[PDB]
């Protein structure tokens, strides 16, 4: 189809420029990634993208505070049952009715995706390698 240019262009950030060999390897990576994308049908690229958005998901201090408390409880089980199923450990920790239980339980690729969606057997057609921004 029509050629989708990555927005914004990739960067060669300044910290990595002190090493003259880095840019070369970067360009190699960007090219091998571009061919890998262009080798896919549009349907399967969209399939994988929406699958990818399923992994993972307030105030971070409060979430980490709770996770620290929970991890100390998980650690108590790991110390005793080194080979126990961690899903079981987690469920037991999360089932206690005091302690932890007091604590309330609280994009370069996406741009290519949005440009492609408004463009809509047929192969993806993206450019990653042009316009590498230096600095």
């Amino acid at each position: 189809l029509s050629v989708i240019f990555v927005k914004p262009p990739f960067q060669l950030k300044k910290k990595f420029q002190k090493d003259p060999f880095y840019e070369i390897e970067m360009r190699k990576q960007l090219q091998m990634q571009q061919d890998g994308i262009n080798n896919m049908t549009i349907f399967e690229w969209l399939k994988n993208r929406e699958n990818f958005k399923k992994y993972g998901r307030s105030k971070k201090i409060q979430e980490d505070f709770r996770d620290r408390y929970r991890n100390a409880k998980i650690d108590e089980y790991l110390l005793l049952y080194e080979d126990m199923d961690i899903k079981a450990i987690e469920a037991m920790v999360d089932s206690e009715l005091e302690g932890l239980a007091a604590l309330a339980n609280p994009g370069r690729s996406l741009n290519i995706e949005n440009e492609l969606l408004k463009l809509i057997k047929i192969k993806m057609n993206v450019n990653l390698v042009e316009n590498l921004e230096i600095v």
Binding site: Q11, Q29, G36, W45, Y55, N71, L78
Partner: protein, 193 residues
Amino acid sequence: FEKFLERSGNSIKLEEFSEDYIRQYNNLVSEKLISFWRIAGIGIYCNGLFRTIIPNDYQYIIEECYPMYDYETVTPFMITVFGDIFAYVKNHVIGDYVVFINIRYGTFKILSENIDILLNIVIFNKSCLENWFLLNEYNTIKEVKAMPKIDECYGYVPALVAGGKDCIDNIQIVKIAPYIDTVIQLMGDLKRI
């Protein structure tokens, strides 16, 4: 770390750490992590699955994808054969923790600050390897692919963030640093697991 040394298959310690170098992390990481540095050095452990790396060589790229409060410091210390990253986070308000950054799926996971349990127990527990680190396919990948050296990893081409399929056919041995840099520039912010 007798347990870590006994349970790691085919360990290769590529180098010891300079003491002057690791002691500048005295106030940034736990005594436990420093003792582990002295034991493990730079090397490849657990039949190639984990590598201990030079922290300052990974410092910039972790600050690129891991957002922090101004009272936090992050110190990378270990990677997976896929280029996932373990780092120790010094946090003066809530206390310390370890963060596991999964470069394939664009997530981070808050782990316990206790390096002793992580490295003598957790990384040998099959269900943690599967459910925490998504490392369960390793023995299957490693019969069909050579061992990446300490500056390489199993990269997906194209990256899973870039629409690639998660299969052994899309894995290539790539240089880890430009790969991780490219994956991060492809993804939005990391998501909490």
